[PDB]
Design a protein around this nucleic acid. Structure first.
Ligand code: MG
Lengths: 67, 104, 114, 98, 55, 121
RNA sequence: AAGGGCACCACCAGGAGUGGAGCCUGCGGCUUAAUUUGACCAACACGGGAAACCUCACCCGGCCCGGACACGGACAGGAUUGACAGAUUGAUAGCUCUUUCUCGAUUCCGUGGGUGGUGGUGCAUGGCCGUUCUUAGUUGGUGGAGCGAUUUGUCUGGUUAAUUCCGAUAACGAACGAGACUCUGGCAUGCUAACUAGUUACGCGACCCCCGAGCGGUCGGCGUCCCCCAACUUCUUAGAGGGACAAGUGGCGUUCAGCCACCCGAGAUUGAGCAAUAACAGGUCUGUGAUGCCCUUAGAUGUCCGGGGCUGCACGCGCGCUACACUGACUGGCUCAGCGUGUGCCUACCCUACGCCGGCAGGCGCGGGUAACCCGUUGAACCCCAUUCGUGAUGGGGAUCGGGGAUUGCAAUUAUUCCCCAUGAACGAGGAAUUCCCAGUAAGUGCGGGUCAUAAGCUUGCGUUGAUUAAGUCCCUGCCCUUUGUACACACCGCC
């Protein structure tokens, strides 16, 4: 045996706590701070990713790219 | 219906085909349809030859296998209707029967 | 015609169907004194006849097990529904059936008898 | 098996509708033939039936290249309380016209 | 792997496209008359199919 | 000089009019559909060649696939063709167009026959 | 050692041959990271083994669990799963990392316990298979002999291919094997039937003779099951039946078994399959969801994917093919087959007519055939008839090697295969040795199937042409029986 490479490290998840990425104030006014995935398959329920240069929809896998 | 039908009989053996080709035509004569004579097609002979050993080590003995397929064609032609008249099949397991028409 | 295969492949498929059914019933009805299977075929429907010593055993509760195997063969080879019937025939002179006596001996030896 | 619920319950209700079910041994088959519109890979149905066999609710007969799973009496009540169905609806092999 | 490489390698023809209809072996199959059976299994079952010996 | 034309014309020589210049097997190869693996390799070489320093050869890129036919647009690249064990870098000369990548990464080392053993008594 | 019989896996007489050259293939050895592995008469064109992937079991890297079930932690304030982009990677493997979205109880970890394995063990095994051994041999019961291992039966003689039979006879009565049996081929103008086979006759026709025949000749041209609108099975098909029995004659023989010649007959010995007891540490755990035990089981010996390899070459061996030429090669013309196949559950992949394009290799449209309807009347090769050549390594020989063109596929390179143009290498008939074989046989000769997406120098069969030698022997290799000898019994490859 004696593989030249070390044993491959499997990815470990970030282990996120409660999501809490949307805020209301002044006795409650909704503010989606995340982009909404527009597709029917994503739905109006889910939010999109907030990457530094694009946005990812978890189901629709649409990437909205901004320069 | 005025119908002119074609009936084929086939199996692996000869005896069952012979007794079917006999009893059907006898029933037809008793039931007064004129019958086209029994036509025996040439026998299919499926030949398969295979090494007896399951190993390949030995004296190269090839075993051969044969499946004789015999088939007969008899046509029923009557001035009257046929299918409403004759319906009984009298078929043993092992023999295949297929009934076609003149247009088929 | 184009849908129906030739005579040769037809006989081949018949033999394959028969061998598979016999082997399945052997592997499944091993303890029930399985002796042999007979299939009677008509274009309207087919009839399957199973020879076994313990017909009362191969038939389940109110015919449950025979229904089970009928559904098995129905869904396996894909017959039209209700075009296959499973008849269990009690063999005569079980001492003459080589398969049944072989299975009884194998059952005895697996039991641990001398 | 990471197989979802949407096919787990579908396979379970197929198994409870009739006392047996027929599966051919091909893990690379894209789809198990019956319930064709349910989009269920053959591997998922095989491992689901294998798990049920492990818990004893179904027994398995292996022919040349096939499975012939026979649901058991201990599978009756398990399908009943997993499908939320009262003990008055039975599989087909259980009662017929009575 | 995912769906894009687990079974991406084509087997729409050839020896790897075929297996014994009985023992799932890929050697000594008889594709004559669509038999799709291994040689040894053909020996095992040739009586059951009906291929018998005459000569 | 591949078929009398120079290299620079071969650079802007598109596939359909180039298939005539290729031999029978290469013409059949281009006539049949190029897959995503070939296109990805071409994009990798293009990116490396454009990011290659001036008057300096590009960095090496590796690949298992050796059935890639050589295009004149890859002349002067560093490609690593797998030999079954390692990726062997190979220059792309302006005369290698009608050649496979695998024709230059030998799959075996040559044989130097030592003394025969007990066999062939 | 004797006595007797017997075999072209023995010889005799012959024939064709191998070994002599090239090439294909498998072993061995060499080399390699890998050249996976079994097999050494009865291994070595064997593993149905003609490997680009797969195959694949070998080498080189990268994925996932396809680790059920139980328990315990972990948890909807989230067990956990996928994935855009950038790197990174051969890879558009979210494989890993930065980055955040998304699934939600299916899944995570640990402990037990699974499971899978072309992993090991054919010297643990079953199954099959080969061999002893296709020779004729082998056993029981009861009875006889023997203290008993055993013997008799199961044999002096004759006869057979045959312990096959007649006979003798402490044996009697059996049993298997052999025989018998089934298929196969050979004659049936006898039966049955025939539009998925035809024959004959007639009528339409076409053409030659038409001097004049004219019921002249050809037609694979068309019709007469298109239903009243000819007959028939000789040919073809396949069933029932028949037919050959040493039946007759002459001779030899105990005049029994039987043997030889001859008549008449299609045939006076058509070939196969099946095939006894006991065995072999013969082969296969790489056929199996056949399997004991052992090994491995998440960095997997499971499994997938990518690439390589199974072809790699100082050499040896085997089965083959091509050939060494004038009994020939080339060019043209004429001319005759039978086996058997042909469109798929997964499974995509059929056999092909005709028409056009191209010179060939192929492609482009129209069909037919799931089949005695279509390919196809399978216009095969060899052979036959004419041409050139002219004894030369020549028009033999086509290995090596270049360029180019086609088909399969995702991929043709270490050339898949086919084709065109170039190259004409050894080879002038083959040592010592050795294979096979007695009539449609050897040999020439092509053709089907198997492997096949592409395919045959292999094999299984098929047909065409078609012999010489022989009707005997134990000399060589052995086989079977009796007697004999033994210091052998793992059994002369012994023992000493
Ligand atoms: Mg010449």
């Amino acid at each position: 045996y004696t593989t030249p490479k070390k044993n491959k490290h499997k990815r470990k998840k970030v282990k996120l706590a409660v999501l809490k990425y949307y805020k209301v104030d002044e006795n409650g006014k909704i503010s989606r701070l995340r982009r909404e995935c527009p597709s029917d398959e994503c739905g109006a329920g889910v939010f999109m990713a907030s990457h530094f240069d694009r946005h990812y929809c978890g189901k629709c896998c649409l990437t909205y790219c901004f320069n | 219906a005025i119908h002119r039908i074609r009936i084929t009989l086939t199996s692996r053996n000869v005896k069952s085909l012979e007794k079917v080709c006999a009893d059907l035509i006898r029933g037809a004569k008793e039931k007064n349809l004129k019958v086209k004579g029994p036509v025996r097609m040439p026998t299919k002979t499926l030949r398969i030859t295979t090494r007896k050993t399951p190993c390949g080590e030995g004296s190269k003995t090839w075993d051969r296998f044969q499946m004789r397929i015999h088939k007969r064609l008899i046509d029923l032609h009557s001035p009257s209707e046929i299918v409403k008249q004759i319906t009984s099949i009298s078929i043993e397991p092992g023999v295949e029967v297929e009934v076609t028409i003149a247009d088929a | 015609m184009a849908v129906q295969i030739s005579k040769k492949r037809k006989f081949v498929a018949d033999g394959i169907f028969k061998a598979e059914l016999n082997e399945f019933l052997t592997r499944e009805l091993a303890e029930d004194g399985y002796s042999g299977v007979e299939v009677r075929v008509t274009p309207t429907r087919t009839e399957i006849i199973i020879l076994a010593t313990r017909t009362q055993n191969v038939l389940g509760e109110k015919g449950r097990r025979i229904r089970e195997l009928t559904a098995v063969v129905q869904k396996r080879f894909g017959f039209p529904e209700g075009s296959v019937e499973l008849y269990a025939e009690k063999v005569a002179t079980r001492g003459l059936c080589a398969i049944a006596q072989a299975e009884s001996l194998r059952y005895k030896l697996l039991g641990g008898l001398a | 098996m990471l197989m979802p619920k949407k096919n787990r319950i579908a396979i379970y209700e197929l198994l409870f509708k009739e006392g047996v079910m027929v599966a051919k041994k091909d893990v690379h088959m894209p789809k198990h033939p019956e319930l064709a519109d349910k989009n269920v890979p053959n591997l998922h149905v095989m491992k689901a039936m294998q798990s049920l066999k492990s818990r004893g609710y179904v027994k398995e007969q292996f022919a040349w290249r096939h499975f012939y799973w026979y649901l058991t009496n201990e599978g009756i009540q398990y399908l009943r309380d997993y499908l939320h169905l009262p003990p008055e609806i039975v599989p087909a092999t259980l009662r017929r016209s009575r | 792997g995912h769906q894009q490489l687990y079974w991406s390698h084509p087997r729409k023809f050839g020896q790897g496209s075929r297996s014994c209809r009985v023992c799932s072996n890929r050697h000594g199959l008889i594709r004559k008359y669509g038999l799709n059976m291994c040689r040894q299994c053909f020996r095992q079952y040739a009586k059951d199919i009906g291929f018998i010996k005459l000569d | 000089t591949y078929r009398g034309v120079d290299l620079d014309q071969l650079l802007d020589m598109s596939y359909e009019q180039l298939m005539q210049l290729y031999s029978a097997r290469q013409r059949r190869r281009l006539n049949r559909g190029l897959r995503r693996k070939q296109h990805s390799l071409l994009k990798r070489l293009r990116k490396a060649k454009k990011e290659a320093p001036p008057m300096e050869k590009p960095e090496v890129v590796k690949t298992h696939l050796r059935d890639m036919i050589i295009l004149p647009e890859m002349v002067g690249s560093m490609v690593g063709v797998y030999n079954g064990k390692t990726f062997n870098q190979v220059e792309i000369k302006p005369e290698m167009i009608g050649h496979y990548l695998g024709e230059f990464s030998i799959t075996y080392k040559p044989v130097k026959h030592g003394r025969p053993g007990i066999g062939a008594t």
